[PDB]
Chain A
Amino acid sequence: TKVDEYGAKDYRLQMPLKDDHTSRPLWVAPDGHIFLEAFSPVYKYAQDFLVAIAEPVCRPTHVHEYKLTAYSLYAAVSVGLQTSDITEYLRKLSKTGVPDGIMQFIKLCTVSYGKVKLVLKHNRYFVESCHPDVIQHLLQDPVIRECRLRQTVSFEVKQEMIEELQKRCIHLEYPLLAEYDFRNDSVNPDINIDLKPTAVLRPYQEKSLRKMFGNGRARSGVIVLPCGAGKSLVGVTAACTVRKRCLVLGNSAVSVEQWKAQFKMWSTIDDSQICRFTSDAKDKPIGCSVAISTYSMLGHTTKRSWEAERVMEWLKTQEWGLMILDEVHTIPAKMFRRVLTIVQAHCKLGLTATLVREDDKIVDLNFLIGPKLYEANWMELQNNGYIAKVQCAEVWCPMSPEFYREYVAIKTKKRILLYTMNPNKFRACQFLIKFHERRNDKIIVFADNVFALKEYAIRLNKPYIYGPTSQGERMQILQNFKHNPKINTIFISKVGDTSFDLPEANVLIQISSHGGSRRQEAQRLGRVLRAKKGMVAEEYNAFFYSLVSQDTQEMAYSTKRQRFLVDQGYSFKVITKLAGMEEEDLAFSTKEEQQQLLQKVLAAT
């Protein structure tokens, strides 16, 4: 609240300093921000406690940055950490005390939890509460009465208005409890699902599952883990532990195929017991219980085919023990979020690797699914070797004079097609791909513009995937990329970042970017994080190139996009020029070739 002569929030008169400040490695700002030291001997204990009570926002190598909120404190109480149980240790760890503001915030957030519980039984959602005064003073506003369908006090509530009531309670200061007591539940018989000994659970996966499984009861929440960390394995393990009907929701055909493959690989459940509720191909969805489908199909708003209608009616009628949702960052979308109310599930687990977006709809996930149980530390995984170390780099390509002339001259938005296609970067990607091809490194080119992707792919006679790309041709291209030595590069469109089962790749070039989006950047970076069989962290075997055009909005897009990665700790090295480019023969060298490319770009319209 106090501002120094600089942008300095002054706290000299706010909180004191502990005498044994050197011993205490923890800081506590009044706003809730906490700065932990990664060099302290008690760093592991401090990390565990701060991860338990707070969500990371920036975890560089030296000083980690966390911030706590109501949802994080509710998650702490869910895992069973009382207000004293957290605040006493926070004061002990803190080297500068705990401000009264944070003290009262923690007290209020902890006490305002568990008073209101939401339990669904016999297809009816009852808002139970041991304390009756909570309901007595909660029925002040008329929205509750119009919502409700027309000790231990409970009342039934309308199915459709659950989301509205939950978001209302979040700001009403009475969070709802979504804990599932699967240990004590006789209404729905347990399913015959078991986890085979073949599956191996990594320490971080076990820690996330422990956060998820506070007790005998399965908690509904979101677990953020890197794509290469085995989030699919974690989800399969969660379903196997639940041992009840499980509905996994992907985001695309590749996602559903990968989910079925993971289920078969890691679970002893028979093939016939798994179905793919996919329009392209189906395996009798009504026949078996364990199902994998897609948000688009479940939330489809237009006319439904007859068979799909029957399947949808069966899904709506049945009750699901577990609802796994991959790539939860897309859930708050209108159609995708409609699926939550369309389908019924006791606990809806959420898995993803890039839980970040610009519009302030990520906060809605806390009530749409539940509090964020865990977020894997990418740097720690890199150190442990579970994820391949990546040498993240941004190659700066100076824009050619003429191309810059038209780009600046035109105030229209042909620049997206223009700066994405310039001789300096076209020569760059070609030369980089040649250098890695002779180095036997697998390449996954990325480009948002399908037009530019197709032009580059035809000029380099490479198998670009995008748009309609038939499913059969997609699978054939992926198989050729994985197996055929003669081909070691695939040009994937935006569809790649949505949800792809792809083989580990040694390099990832990105010629174009959709925008300054930290979701797409992290999603595409996660592809190369797949740890190799016997690599080493310091070898920097994995490479990521984000080609940008100098003196263009792409520079702004790239800076507005690498924020999340730099917060994690990756250092993006800038490459002004590439050695050997002049000697290597590449197209668009002489002025004439650049001229024809510019003419084609202009005629593109």
Chain B
Amino acid sequence: GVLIECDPAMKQFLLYLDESNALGKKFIIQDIDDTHVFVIAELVNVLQERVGEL
């Protein structure tokens, strides 16, 4: 997978997109801890657009 280090309060932000996006089967494939998540490789550049509202 793709190791992504984030904030514990921000981990659930990517989980809401998993239950909303209907592109693939499941966005998040594995959750290590509150500061480590995994992902099919393709949405880091798309997430940069959501920084303006975050």
Contacts of B13 in A (CB 8 A): 405, 408
Q: Mark A399-415, 1 if CB is under 8 A from B, else 0.
A: 11110110011000000
Q: Are A402 and B9 in contact (CB under 8 A)?
A: yes
Give the residue among B9, B12, B54 with the most A Cβ atoms within 10 A: B9
Contacts of A405 in B (CB 8 A): 9, 12-13
Q: Mark A550-566, 1 if CB is under 8 A from B, else 0.
A: 01000000000000000
Contacts of B8 in A (CB 8 A): 401
Q: Mark B7-19, 1 if CB is under 8 A from A, else 0.
A: 1111011001000
Q: CB within 8 A of B16: which of A399, A400, A404, A409?
A: A409
Query: What's the least CB distance linking A412 to chain B, in Å?
Result: 15
Contacts of A400 in B (CB 8 A): 9
Query: What's the least CB distance linking A427 to chain B, in Å?
Result: 16
Contacts of B7 in A (CB 8 A): 401
Contacts of A402 in B (CB 8 A): 9
Cβ-closest chain A residue relative to B13:
A408
- Within the assembled complex, what's the spacing in Å between the Cα atoms of A204 and B7? 53
Cβ-closest chain B residue relative to A398:
B9
- Within the assembled complex, what's the spacing in Å between the Cα atoms of A401 and B10? 7
Cβ-closest chain A residue relative to B15:
A405
Cβ-closest chain A residue relative to B7:
A401
Interface majority SS on B: helix, strand, loop or mixed?
Answer: helix
Query: What's the least CB distance linking B21 to chain A, in Å?
Result: 16
Contacts of B10 in A (CB 8 A): 401, 404
Q: Mark A404-434, 1 if CB is under 8 A from B, else 0.
A: 1100110000000000000000000000000
- Sort chain A's interface into a size bin: under 10
State which residues 366-416 of A face B: CB under 8 Å. Answer: 399-402, 404-405, 408-409
State which residues 464-485 of A face B: CB under 8 Å. Answer: none
Contacts across chains A and B counted by CB atoms under 8 Å: 16
- Within the assembled complex, what's the spacing in Å between the Cα atoms of A551 and B54? 6
Query: What's the least CB distance linking A410 to chain B, in Å?
Result: 11
- Sort chain B's interface into a size bin: under 10
- Within the assembled complex, what's the spacing in Å between the Cα atoms of A402 and B8? 9
Cβ-closest chain B residue relative to A399:
B9
Query: What's the least CB distance linking B51 to chain A, in Å?
Result: 10
Contacts of A404 in B (CB 8 A): 9-10
State which residues 8-36 of B face A: CB under 8 Å. Answer: 8-10, 12-13, 16
State which residues 548-599 of A face B: CB under 8 Å. Answer: 551
- Within the assembled complex, what's the spacing in Å between the Cα atoms of A400 and B10? 10
- Known contacts A408-B54, A551-B54, A401 near B16 by CB under 8 Å: no
- Within the assembled complex, what's the spacing in Å between the Cα atoms of A404 and B13? 10
Contacts of B54 in A (CB 8 A): 408, 551
Query: What's the least CB distance linking A555 to chain B, in Å?
Result: 11
State which residues 229-262 of A face B: CB under 8 Å. Answer: none
Query: What's the least CB distance linking B32 to chain A, in Å?
Result: 17
Query: What's the least CB distance linking B15 to chain A, in Å?
Result: 10
- Within the assembled complex, what's the spacing in Å between the Cα atoms of A186 and B24? 90
Contacts of B12 in A (CB 8 A): 405
- Within the assembled complex, what's the spacing in Å between the Cα atoms of A404 and B10? 8
Cβ-closest chain A residue relative to B53:
A408
Contacts of A409 in B (CB 8 A): 16
Contacts of A401 in B (CB 8 A): 7-10
Query: What's the least CB distance linking A548 to chain B, in Å?
Result: 16
Query: What's the least CB distance linking A514 to chain B, in Å?
Result: 22
- Within the assembled complex, what's the spacing in Å between the Cα atoms of A409 and B13? 8
Cβ-closest chain B residue relative to A402:
B9
Query: What's the least CB distance linking B27 to chain A, in Å?
Result: 16
Cβ-closest chain A residue relative to B11:
A401
Query: What's the least CB distance linking B28 to chain A, in Å?
Result: 16
- Within the assembled complex, what's the spacing in Å between the Cα atoms of A551 and B9? 12
Contacts of A399 in B (CB 8 A): 9
- Within the assembled complex, what's the spacing in Å between the Cα atoms of A408 and B17? 12
Contacts of B9 in A (CB 8 A): 399-402, 404-405
- Within the assembled complex, what's the spacing in Å between the Cα atoms of A402 and B9? 6
Query: What's the least CB distance linking A425 to chain B, in Å?
Result: 15
Query: What's the least CB distance linking A551 to chain B, in Å?
Result: 6
Give the residue among A400, A405, A409, A551 with the most B Cβ atoms within 10 A: A405
Query: What's the least CB distance linking A408 to chain B, in Å?
Result: 6
Cβ-closest chain B residue relative to A405:
B12
Query: What's the least CB distance linking B52 to chain A, in Å?
Result: 11
Cβ-closest chain A residue relative to B12:
A405
- Within the assembled complex, what's the spacing in Å between the Cα atoms of A402 and B12? 9
- Within the assembled complex, what's the spacing in Å between the Cα atoms of A404 and B53? 13
Query: What's the least CB distance linking A401 to chain B, in Å?
Result: 2
Contacts of B16 in A (CB 8 A): 409
Cβ-closest chain B residue relative to A406:
B12
- Within the assembled complex, what's the spacing in Å between the Cα atoms of A401 and B7? 8
Query: What's the least CB distance linking A549 to chain B, in Å?
Result: 13
Query: What's the least CB distance linking B31 to chain A, in Å?
Result: 15
> Would you give 16 A-B contacts (Cβ < 8 Å), ordered by A?
A399-B9, A400-B9, A401-B7, A401-B8, A401-B9, A401-B10, A402-B9, A404-B9, A404-B10, A405-B9, A405-B12, A405-B13, A408-B13, A408-B54, A409-B16, A551-B54
Top 4 closest pairs, chain A to chain B, by CB = A401-B9, A404-B9, A405-B12, A401-B8
Hey, which bits of chain A sit against chain B, CB under 8 A? 399-402, 404-405, 408-409, 551
